[PDB]
């Protein structure tokens, strides 16, 4: 994973996202959704999803939430006050903690001012608590600003490492982007059915035809502009549409 003071930032993009494999995986110790309850994720579409990743203590997972305070949310990773995404977290004691202490997971414990939301700060300047200038050397009131979790496998829960992923769905002003899956089914012929091809919605009886579209053409229509043929998006075969008998 990535440190807590330099989190990662992956920009998930146009894709088919299935938040159900996440939501029901039961391996997550914390799955909170804020802008939107979890079950309705696989039924919405946004412009971008960002995923941030890092590793913290066990009992600092309650500062990854909109409107908190503490050494993590103050200056390591700040969530805006109208967050929209979801926060996922699971214990990882066996992967990240090693006998003798894993001193490779640091965090920032001194900063001039709390972070703006989603702001990031990887500098390593000597912090200056008192009024006396520091001149790049340590001493009283001149402190190195990074400390390290010394993780060890015999730590009580709440001191063992937890891995955290923060999904943030954003909606700028584009034309569209990633959304949740879309079902599908077999196709029966010679019966009055309710069909739906990609958004073409109607009812009638579908037969096989003797037309020949052009490779980019997706459905046909006649004079008076009624749909009388269609292409189905998996066989690449065109089908005649006939209204279901009436009188």
């Amino acid at each position, epitope marked *: 994973f990535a440190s807590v003071y330099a989190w990662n930032r992956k920009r998930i993009s146009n894709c088919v996202a299935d938040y159900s494999v996440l939501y029901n995986s039961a391996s997550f110790s914390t799955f909170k959704c804020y802008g939107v309850s979890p079950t309705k994720l696989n039924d919405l579409c946004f412009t971008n999803v960002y995923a941030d990743s890092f590793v913290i203590r066990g009992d600092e997972v309650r500062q990854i939430a909109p409107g908190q305070t503490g050494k993590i949310a103050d200056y390591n990773y700040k969530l805006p006050d109208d967050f929209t995404g979801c926060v996922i977290a699971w214990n990882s004691n066996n992967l990240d903690s090693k006998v003798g202490g894993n001193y490779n997971y640091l965090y920032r414990l001194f900063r001039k001012s709390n972070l703006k939301p989603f702001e990031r700060d990887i500098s390593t300047e000597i912090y200056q608590a008192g009024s006396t200038p520091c001149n790049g050397v*340590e001493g009283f009131n001149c402190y*190195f600003p990074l400390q390290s979790y010394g993780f060890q496998p015999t730590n009580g829960v709440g001191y063992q490492p937890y891995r955290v992923v923060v999904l943030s769905f954003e909606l700028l002003h584009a034309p569209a982007t990633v959304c949740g899956p879309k079902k599908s089914t077999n196709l029966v012929k010679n019966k009055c059915v309710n069909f739906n091809f990609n958004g073409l919605t109607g009812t009638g009886v579908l037969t096989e035809s003797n037309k020949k579209f052009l490779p980019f053409q997706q459905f046909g229509r006649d004079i008076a502009d009624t749909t009388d043929a269609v292409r189905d998006p998996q066989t690449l075969e065109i089908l005649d549409i006939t209204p279901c008998s009436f009188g």
Partner: antibody
Framework: TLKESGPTLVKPTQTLTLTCTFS??????????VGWIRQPPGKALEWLAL???????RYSPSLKSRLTITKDTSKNQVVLTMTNMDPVDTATYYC???????????????????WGQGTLVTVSS | DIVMTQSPDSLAVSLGERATINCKSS????????????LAWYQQKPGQPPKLLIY???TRESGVPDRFSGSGSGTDFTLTISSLQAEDVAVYYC?????????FGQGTKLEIK
């Protein structure tokens, strides 16, 4: 793992080096030091001198004139020379290993963390 | 200057019993930029130096029994030693770097009843 080596009975007014021989750690990385302490009998303790990783030396302002420290990361020691012996300095002389002065709101310098043992000093002719 | 006034002097605590020592700093010694107290408890064995028992007032040192544990708030600072063993005939200290001079606890007689 510190240990303060030194002579046991002293005579007045002369300068006196002092050796806190340690091991188990070095003494030149950002966040490390060793503070030197005395305590006369019945009194509370008195830290005397200190030196950090890039040799940031501290002393008591009263015997700033007489205390003169230097760290020995190589020997895992610290040399502190100290002048003007007098019988009210009849103390046993300690060293204590500083670590991450970010924690520094807990001890009044009196202690620290490591701490060796101490070489006794008595002022008698 | 923030004087550290101990709790129980000639403590006649029985064997295996909760021995209590309070420390009353005269001022609130909390560095509020930590959300965590600092205090260093110490054990002078007679003829021996005081050794660090609990730093951060909640983070016990290595190799130390967890039957000793630290507590306290604001200006009152207690010590939750749950059991007084036969090894506990010693002298004890509490202090604060959150000051200027060498403030001190005064030291307690640990008679084992």
């Amino acid at each position: 793992t510190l240990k303060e080596s030194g002579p046991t009975l002293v005579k007045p007014t002369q300068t006196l080096t002092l050796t806190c021989t340690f091991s188990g750690f070095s003494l030149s990385t950002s966040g490390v030091g060793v503070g030197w302490i005395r305590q006369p009998p019945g009194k509370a303790l008195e830290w005397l001198a200190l030196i950090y990783w890039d040799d940031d030396k501290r002393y008591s302002p009263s015997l700033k004139s007489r205390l003169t420290i230097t760290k020995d990361t190589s020997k895992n020691q610290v040399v502190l020379t100290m002048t003007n012996m007098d019988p009210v300095d009849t103390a046993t002389y300690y060293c204590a290993h500083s670590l991450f002065l970010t924690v520094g709101y807990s001890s009044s310098w009196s202690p620290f963390d490591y701490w060796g043992q101490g070489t006794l000093v008595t002022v008698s002719s | 200057d923030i004087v550290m006034t101990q709790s129980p002097d000639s403590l006649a605590v029985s064997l295996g019993e909760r021995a209590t020592i309070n420390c009353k700093s005269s001022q609130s010694v909390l560095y509020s930029s930590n959300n965590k107290n600092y205090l260093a408890w110490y054990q002078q064995k007679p003829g021996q130096p005081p050794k660090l028992l609990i730093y951060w007032a909640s983070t016990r040192e290595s190799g130390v029994p967890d039957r000793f544990s630290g507590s306290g708030s604001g200006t009152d600072f207690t010590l939750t030693i749950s059991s007084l063993q036969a090894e506990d005939v010693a002298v004890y200290y509490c202090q604060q770097y959150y000051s200027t001079p060498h403030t001190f606890g005064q030291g307690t007689k640990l008679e084992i009843k």
